[PDB]
Design an enzyme around this catalytic site. Structure first.
Site, PDB file in Angstrom:
ATOM      1  N   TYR A 148      -9.523  -2.582  10.502  1.00 16.73           N
ATOM      2  CA  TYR A 148      -9.056  -1.599   9.527  1.00 16.73           C
ATOM      3  C   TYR A 148      -9.365  -0.228  10.165  1.00 16.73           C
ATOM      4  O   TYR A 148      -8.474   0.396  10.738  1.00 16.73           O
ATOM      5  CB  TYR A 148      -9.764  -1.804   8.179  1.00 16.73           C
ATOM      6  CG  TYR A 148      -9.303  -0.880   7.077  1.00 16.73           C
ATOM      7  CD1 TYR A 148      -8.067  -1.062   6.452  1.00 16.73           C
ATOM      8  CD2 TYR A 148     -10.109   0.171   6.650  1.00 16.73           C
ATOM      9  CE1 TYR A 148      -7.648  -0.212   5.431  1.00 16.73           C
ATOM     10  CE2 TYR A 148      -9.705   1.019   5.638  1.00 16.73           C
ATOM     11  CZ  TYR A 148      -8.478   0.825   5.030  1.00 16.73           C
ATOM     12  OH  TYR A 148      -8.100   1.679   4.022  1.00 16.73           O
TER      13      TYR A 148
ATOM     14  N   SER B 211      -2.401  -1.525   5.648  1.00 18.80           N
ATOM     15  CA  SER B 211      -2.537  -0.154   5.162  1.00 18.80           C
ATOM     16  C   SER B 211      -3.011   0.708   6.334  1.00 18.80           C
ATOM     17  O   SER B 211      -2.279   0.871   7.313  1.00 18.80           O
ATOM     18  CB  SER B 211      -3.498  -0.116   3.970  1.00 18.80           C
ATOM     19  OG  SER B 211      -3.310   1.054   3.188  1.00 18.80           O
TER      20      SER B 211
ATOM     21  N   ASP C 213       5.474  -1.098  -3.491  1.00 18.03           N
ATOM     22  CA  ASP C 213       4.260  -0.584  -2.897  1.00 18.03           C
ATOM     23  C   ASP C 213       4.262   0.927  -3.033  1.00 18.03           C
ATOM     24  O   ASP C 213       4.723   1.654  -2.141  1.00 18.03           O
ATOM     25  CB  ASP C 213       4.088  -0.977  -1.430  1.00 18.03           C
ATOM     26  CG  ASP C 213       2.734  -0.539  -0.874  1.00 18.03           C
ATOM     27  OD1 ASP C 213       2.041   0.260  -1.549  1.00 18.03           O
ATOM     28  OD2 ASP C 213       2.346  -0.986   0.227  1.00 18.03           O
TER      29      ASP C 213
ATOM     30  N   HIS D 204       1.290  -2.944  -3.017  1.00 21.20           N
ATOM     31  CA  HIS D 204       0.341  -2.837  -1.920  1.00 21.20           C
ATOM     32  C   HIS D 204      -0.463  -4.101  -1.650  1.00 21.20           C
ATOM     33  O   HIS D 204      -0.906  -4.325  -0.520  1.00 21.20           O
ATOM     34  CB  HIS D 204      -0.581  -1.651  -2.145  1.00 21.20           C
ATOM     35  CG  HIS D 204      -1.176  -1.103  -0.890  1.00 21.20           C
ATOM     36  ND1 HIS D 204      -0.416  -0.709   0.199  1.00 21.20           N
ATOM     37  CD2 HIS D 204      -2.464  -0.841  -0.558  1.00 21.20           C
ATOM     38  CE1 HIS D 204      -1.204  -0.236   1.135  1.00 21.20           C
ATOM     39  NE2 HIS D 204      -2.455  -0.306   0.697  1.00 21.20           N
TER      40      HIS D 204
END
Length: 710
Positions: free
Chosen positions: A473, A554, A641, A680
């Site tokens: 991430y 993301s 999203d 999302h």
């Protein structure tokens, strides 16, 4: 392998914008409009080639069958008490949404309290936030449709699970907090806006306000308690102190762990809540984080990072508020991050630390901050906890890469505390003893040692023959800790893979300094760290470039997309989920303005210079060497999203297909799948989760031609 042709996509070559002298063409800018016939046709044409590619081979069906079998296990959340009743979430196994149960006592029979599954045929209506009244007799809950961040708050009287008429609309990124008199509840709402507000729009969200809803009235009568007209990006979240005397307002602007902290002594209001409250601006700046733990009269205990990157506990007395007077209750640790703190049984504090990316749980005395007891835990994460100030017991949930988890319980009224296993479920088909989880620290480009967890079958030879799945991430102070994933374990067991999670900078693994090490001018550190994780896996013999898949979602979608552009030679497959791809325009849509604290904003020349170097949308380039092509890439997004508007993935795939896809040397597929009635990710029904992982692993299997191991 490409038996299909990329859809023809119009290039608006007149779409040129000047960024501080740097001209940027955005030929697919029209894809920013989700409602146009052009964009809808683009999505249809893309899904038309992606779906058959994913479903052609028997592998997807084999994976889906196995996922459906293995993911079918009873799932419980830990119990939590509200008033005189206990509550817990439970999913028998494959229900689209977990169900909230209630029981009058621990030994009592449980009954369904709130079942979101009956709210839709496909499980696309999900619970998103909730708050019980102080006495536990009333309940407010948010509902989101099709994965959108938008929430509709509804209410129920707990006794008899009676539906009330109260309905609150225009709610998003809202806190929910009832005043202790049981009269009403604080919540946040955005003003009316033109166009849609269902999750398919891209409209920027500004001017969020704080309202107070009196139970039994229409929303139009709600009281405006706080607003920031001259600061459109500020968001004020309210909560009540444990004794119900103070409303604490935490004001945020952006995504950094900092907040203003204002308070309202409710007893000092002239005639109850009737308008803008008499706010006392205790902390009136964005220099630090102040998270309310508890208070004893005017002495407030907060978890803070003020001059303490690893966090600590301080006591601020409202009657002697100057910083020089604050007491340090639990000092900062040299390396371990204090993740969260709870106050339970009046004078106990439960502290959760992160030690080398693993959680520890400790009980401390509220008055002195002294350590009283350590709650033993295996290597993993604490993913659930219950126990407020008036409670006399705690429940906590543990999970790891190999175990579905254990829920513990501890009666804190006992003189000799003895934590006990309360609930533990076993997943048949997966033998944890067959696998191994190791943590290593690898050097990045600048020499910084980065942690990485590697999960694999015991006894494998490090000959580089194994396919690997590397996840990351890297941002927003988020720590990527051990978590149980049936989908990833199927990759290990049935696809002979190696799982790896790299704790790259930008995260919160080593506190705020770790976060700052992967943001703004230093965002490239994230990408370097991740690329170095891949190099480590290859050099150490866990895998090879052609067998390596990288994944992120993301901010993690940005991570893997950038890595594909920067080191296409290092990866065989890339799956970017709901990723931020246009770093020059992200701030223009929905809540994207909040991410500038990690990324910067292109309006600044200095920031633009950072952004342009790594923005996925702006760095698609054919590899120089003739023997190097782009890895197989799959972008996953959904039409609702509204967190990361899908235009990011739409524009990126159009660019990949045009610049790279058209080249003769490019044989690896570059595809996108846009789902419907999804967003999302939060609240996605089980059926959709299963389809998604099936798509992901079928893509990997087909691209790398991996044999299914039954």
């Amino acid at each position: 392998m490409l038996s299909f042709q990329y859809p023809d996509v119009y290039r608006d070559e007149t779409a040129i914008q000047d960024y501080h002298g740097h001209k940027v063409c955005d030929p697919y800018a029209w894809l920013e409009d989700p409602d146009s016939e052009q964009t809808k046709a683009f999505v249809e044409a893309q899904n038309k080639i992606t779906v058959p590619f994913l479903e052609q081979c028997p592998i997807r069906g084999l994976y889906k069958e196995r996922m459906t079998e293995l993911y079918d296990y009873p799932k419980y959340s830990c119990h939590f008490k509200k008033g005189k009743r206990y509550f817990y979430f439970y999913n028998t196994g494959l229900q689209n949404q977990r169900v909230l149960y209630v029981q009058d006592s621990l030994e009592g029979e449980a009954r369904v309290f709130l079942d979101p599954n009956i709210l839709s045929d496909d499980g696309t209506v999900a619970l998103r936030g909730y708050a019980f009244s102080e006495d536990g007799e009333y309940f407010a809950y948010g509902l989101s449709a099709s994965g959108s961040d938008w929430v509709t708050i509804k209410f129920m009287k707990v006794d008899g699970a009676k539906e009330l008429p109260d309905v609150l609309e225009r709610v998003k990124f809202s806190c929910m907090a009832w005043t202790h008199d049981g009269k009403g509840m604080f919540y946040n709402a955005y003003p009316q806006q033109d166009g849609k507000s269902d999750g398919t729009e891209t409209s920027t969200n500004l001017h969020q306000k704080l309202y107070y809803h009196v139970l039994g009235t229409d929303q139009s009568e709600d009281i405006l308690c706080a607003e920031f007209p001259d600061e459109p990006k500020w968001m004020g979240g309210a909560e009540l102190s444990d004794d119900g005397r103070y409303v604490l307002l935490s004001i945020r602007e952006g995504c950094d762990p900092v907040n203003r902290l204002w308070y309202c002594d409710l007893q000092q209001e002239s005639n109850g809540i009737t308008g803008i409250l008499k706010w006392v601006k205790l902390i009136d700046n964005f220099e630090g984080e102040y998270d309310y733990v508890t208070n004893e009269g005017t002495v407030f205990t907060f978890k803070t990072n003020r001059h303490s990157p690893n966090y600590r506990l301080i006591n601020i007395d409202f009657t002697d508020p100057e910083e020089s007077k604050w007491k340090v209750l639990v000092p900062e640790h040299e390396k371990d991050v204090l993740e969260w703190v709870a106050c339970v049984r009046s004078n106990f504090l439960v502290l959760c630390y992160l030690h080398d990316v693993k959680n520890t749980l400790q009980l401390h005395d509220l008055a002195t901050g002294a350590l009283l007891k350590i709650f033993p835990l295996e290597v993993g994460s604490v993913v659930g906890y219950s126990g407020q100030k008036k409670d006399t017991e705690i429940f906590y949930q543990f999970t790891s890469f190999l175990s579905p988890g254990i829920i513990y319980h501890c009666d804190l009224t006992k003189e000799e505390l003895e934590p006990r296993v309360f609930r533990e479920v076993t997943v048949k088909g997966i033998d944890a003893s067959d696998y191994q989880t190791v943590q290593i620290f690898y050097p990045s480009k600048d020499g910084t040692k980065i942690p990485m967890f590697i999960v694999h079958k015991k006894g494998i030879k490090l000959d580089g023959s194994h396919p690997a799945f590397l996840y990351g991430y890297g941002g927003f102070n988020i720590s990527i800790t051990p978590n149980y994933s049936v989908s990833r374990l199927i990759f290990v067991r049935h696809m002979g893979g190696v799982l790896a999670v790299a704790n790259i900078r930008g995260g919160g693994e080593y506190g705020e300094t770790w976060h700052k090490g992967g943001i703004l001018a230093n965002k490239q550190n994230c990408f370097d760290d991740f690329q170095c994780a891949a190099e480590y896996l290859i050099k150490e013999g866990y895998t090879s470039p052609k067998r390596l898949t990288i994944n992120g979602g993301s901010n993690g979608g940005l991570l893997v997309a950038t890595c594909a552009n920067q080191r296409p030679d290092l990866f065989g497959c890339v799956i970017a989920q709901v990723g931020v791809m246009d770093m020059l325009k992200f701030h223009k849509y929905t809540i994207g303005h909040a991410w500038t604290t990690d990324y910067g904003c292109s309006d600044s020349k200095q920031h633009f210079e950072w952004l342009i170097k790594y923005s996925p949308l702006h760095n698609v380039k054919l590899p120089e060497a003739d023997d190097i092509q782009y890895p197989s890439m799959l972008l996953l997004t959904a039409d609702h999203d509204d967190r990361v508007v899908p235009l990011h993935s739409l524009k990126f795939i159009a660019t990949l297909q045009y610049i790279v896809g058209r080249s003769r040397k490019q044989n690896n597929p570059l595809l996108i799948h846009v789902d419907t009635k999804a967003g999302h990710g939060a609240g996605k029904p089980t059926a959709k989760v299963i389809e998604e992982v099936s798509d992901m692993f079928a893509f990997i299997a087909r691209c790398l031609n991996i044999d299914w191991i039954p």
